[PDB]
Amino acid sequence: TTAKEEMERFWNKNLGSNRPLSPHITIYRWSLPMAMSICHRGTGIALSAGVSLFGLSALLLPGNFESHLELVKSLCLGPTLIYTAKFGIVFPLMYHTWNGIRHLIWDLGKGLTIPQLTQSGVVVLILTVLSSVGLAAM
Amino acid sequence: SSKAASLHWTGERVVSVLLLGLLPAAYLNPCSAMDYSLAAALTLHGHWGIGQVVTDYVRGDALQKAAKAGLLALSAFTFAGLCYFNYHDVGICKAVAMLWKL
Amino acid sequence: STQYPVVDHEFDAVVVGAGGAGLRAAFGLSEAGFNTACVTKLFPTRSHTVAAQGGINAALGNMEEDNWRWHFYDTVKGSDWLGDQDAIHYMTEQAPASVVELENYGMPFSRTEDGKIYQRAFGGQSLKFGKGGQAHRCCCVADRTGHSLLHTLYGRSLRYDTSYFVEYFALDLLMENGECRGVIALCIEDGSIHRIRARNTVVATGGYGRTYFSCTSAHTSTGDGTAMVTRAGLPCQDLEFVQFHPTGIYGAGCLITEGCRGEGGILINSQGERFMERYAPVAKDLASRDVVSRSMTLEIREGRGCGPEKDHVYLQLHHLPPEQLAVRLPGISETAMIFAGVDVTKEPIPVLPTVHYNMGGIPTNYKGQVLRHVNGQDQVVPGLYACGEAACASVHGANRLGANSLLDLVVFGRACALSIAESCRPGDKVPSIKPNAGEESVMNLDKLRFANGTIRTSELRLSMQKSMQSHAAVFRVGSVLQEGCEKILRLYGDLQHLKTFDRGMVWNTDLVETLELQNLMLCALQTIYGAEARKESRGAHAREDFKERVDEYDYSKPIQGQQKKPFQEHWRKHTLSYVDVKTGKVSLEYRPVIDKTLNEADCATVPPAIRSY
Amino acid sequence: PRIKKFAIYRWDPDKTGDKPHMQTYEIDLNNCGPMVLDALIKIKNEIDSTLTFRRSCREGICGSCAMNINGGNTLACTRRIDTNLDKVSKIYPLPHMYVIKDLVPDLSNFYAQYKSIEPYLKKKDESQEGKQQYLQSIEEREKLDGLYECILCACCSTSCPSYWWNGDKYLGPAVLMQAYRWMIDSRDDFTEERLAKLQDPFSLYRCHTIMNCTGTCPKGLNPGKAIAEIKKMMATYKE
Ligand SMILES: *Cc1cc2c(cc1C)nc1c(=O)[nH]c(=O)nc-1n2C[C@H](O)[C@H](O)[C@H](O)COP(=O)(O)OP(=O)(O)OC[C@H]1O[C@@H](n2cnc3c(N)ncnc32)[C@H](O)[C@@H]1O
Ligand code: HEM
């Protein structure tokens, strides 16, 4: 009875049985480390979604870039309302950038302890907020 | 008996530290040369990123190949689309520069 | 009965049990090319040997000059001359080989400056035949020696084609005409019944610590193999000999390792005295387990208890350097904090003598073969073997030495396997079993499954656990033992008045623990009756009516100018115990302790002498 | 008098159509030991004997408890009851597993994954074994600290979202740590091919360093640290 045979028999038994699956995310406790990995996906997903939209529209939509910017100027420009879309663009990018460094630092083997996760994680958040409020102001 | 999985991983981290190289390197000194390498790194790092999400969530071999191919197309159009924007329009750097001047 | 599906299996050998013993016997048989099944009610890694802490004795001599013959002396000296010296020769002779085998298997033993296996000082062990001073032969993986032992053993068990029945509860032996043909077992998962027939059967189920209210042993230590042999009508040996470990935590009664005492740990009373110096001057708190706890238990009735109830004693590590606790004793350092809330580095542990190990069990050859008692003489039961705590080759006799059961396990598990390999060949006629056979064991299962009595399984368990705890403790008297006897008999009467609740087949633990109660009761009866019958004080068994060591001679003076006693006038002999299952009556006989070794020229017989530390 | 309420997951397989639900049990904490198991055993013995769970050691070295207490995975026998009476204790079977009955899951797949990494010492020359003790320096042996202590309780793999989604092909932290344990064991000769065994997308590379595992461990061990370290070797080993 090899390890590969044991597994084929596990899946054969359980799927063919009226056994329920034990609840996971519905019951498992929220921790900062987890919530920050979830957000890293979303930012990553959202960010590619934008890079794809920007590149895809460069091929599909008529007119140049300025042409599209003059259409932005035309939609009754809000004063602080323009600083919002500018922040909404830059907030996920900064978060994903900082936490990305954090991921690279883990990939090196450093800072992988429960205390060090809470600190480095909290540092990322502060770094996101500050460089997000900072960039939108440029 | 290749090392294709670990080479992928090291490649991912490479372009990751390379894209982190280019973001500051683009603000300081924006040029034609920087726009294409940003399009390269951007779509590549992006492509391999979605690759992981696909392999994680897309269950079954039937859908696995389709998602991959479907993503390959979406990436190849994204890269070429940015390179078009780079040659035939203002370019990524200056496009952002204009967007932030607004 | 037509409600239960019976699945029949065919093998060369069955090993019931997956402790250290079980595993080593189970893959021993497969290494030697037998189609082998290992039955176990728990997943191998969950077995008890996991809880093992201190070490495994082998005369490797990595710390000083050593000799396995010195190990021998200490072990027979420890056994208070009830240990069968032929099994004690075999085990110590084999130790340095058996331990190296484990290290080559991949056991992460702690290391010395040279890079050899680290050995530790442990209770009751000496150089130069008891006159050369404290010996250091307790091989150890820090504070977790048994855990590492079990996992590497299990690690290895995977290399071979042994067919395991994980979480299967063995019910009874498959007996036909005084010969053993396998086991009938319950499949805990789907609730089905399995007869697994084979030419040989190894029982390695471990002891029955759970007969008491306070024990370092696990919940699943219920003497299940011991009960099967009892139900078979075969005898059990020396069951009254129950070892109390000196150092179990006041709280959940968990084991703090004797390794603490060897590493320099000291036992202290309420008045600050290192009380062991008053008792055993030479060996101090590193004396024999029977002797150490005896002194502890005595300090308490004298008013020198340490708690608010004045009922425990302190084990102190405070003085030892923190790095020593870190490298040597990290395992207890955590469990001391978890249960007693103690920082060993700052405060001493509240410890207490608590039930630990069962030297008695199933009569065994030095080879491993199960014995019955016929015409006052030893006779081999065909197809039956037993090794480890469940057994009794009586390598430990009246008192076990520290780090010796783990050896016992790995040494005899192995022996069982060679002894089968040498006697027969695989592919030999597997003896066929009756169509009906096992009928009675299912009849029993079914009865308990739908039990509609008045006494809950746990209410009758606690009644037994408390009654053994107060009538068969460290010290016992005729009166108190007698009162215990007719109390455990009343409780066996109540075995047919019990209540069960779960009517399901799947994982019916209600039923499984009720089967365990039947087993535990049979174990308790024999333990307490044999204890009442033994009118002497030898090793663990301490009578306050008969505190004298009663041997064939008065060995406390010049031998052989003296009148030898008739067999049934001394107690230097093994208690064989039977029980009629229908009425729970304990009838009991005796057989002699084996004094001769395997080779006098290599290992001299150690005669009885004054035993003190 | 101090009454603590417990919300426990229940499922009888032999009951027709009875699906999973929560049952509440009320315990007096004055007649009950400090740990969560002590409670489960107590209700088993006094309130309901249908409550089904694994337990052996009650010392925290066998790995039998292995349940989801109040949000996370631990060992019941080693976790103390929250003395806050206003709170209700939520007890679940280990996350994302097929439930056999109540708090007992099917760990057989997990076990098989452990079986596939070859958790034993391997030597190139097997002929000289059983007669000499192998040499390992005290420095070499310390590399195994924090690694060998594992108890295979499956808390960590059962907390890992990668193991939730891809538990079929992803080996999980519990098992991956042990591969590392054998990798840096000086006495092992098969380091290179132990790493070659992980050369695919799923076995090791489903770890995205979520670090739930280390956060849940009952023993204080650090699975993720080893995964991280495994990946490092995978990138840097030769031929
Ligand atoms: C309690 C204890 C004992 C101990 C120790 C620490 C603790 C906490 N430390 C020791 C040490 O450091 N050195 C040493 O020499 N001894 C130590 N001890 C004692 C020692 O651990 C035991 O003597 C020994 O380990 C017992 O193991 P054994 O292999 O003999 O049996 P087991 O480990 O308890 O496992 C029994 C197996 O049998 C199966 N079983 C039982 N009944 C059935 C039925 N009904 N059907 C099917 N299978 C059954 C169990 O599943 C188990 O696998
Ligand atoms: C230079 C700044 C960036 C750095 C340092 C960085 C780094 C990383 C790293 C290390 C990962 C892997 C995380 C893991 O181990 O699971 C990752 C994931 C990902 N990244 Fe980036 N990234 C950056 C910017 C971007 C941008 C601009 C995009 C948009 C195209 C992007 C898209 C993604 C996607 C889609 C993922 C997959 C999400 C996941 O698997 O969890 N990243 N990033």
Ligand SMILES: CNC(=O)c1ccccc1I
């Ligand atoms: C909810 N947890 C996930 O599925 C997840 C989140 C972030 C990164 C990787 C993963 I596998």
Ligand code: SF4
């Ligand atoms: S690393 Fe910890 S959580 Fe994981 S199996 Fe081992 S003991 Fe359990």
Ligand code: F3S
């Ligand atoms: S949580 Fe899972 S994905 Fe990771 S680092 Fe631990 S194995």
Ligand code: FES
């Ligand atoms: S019961 Fe042994 S670990 Fe919890």
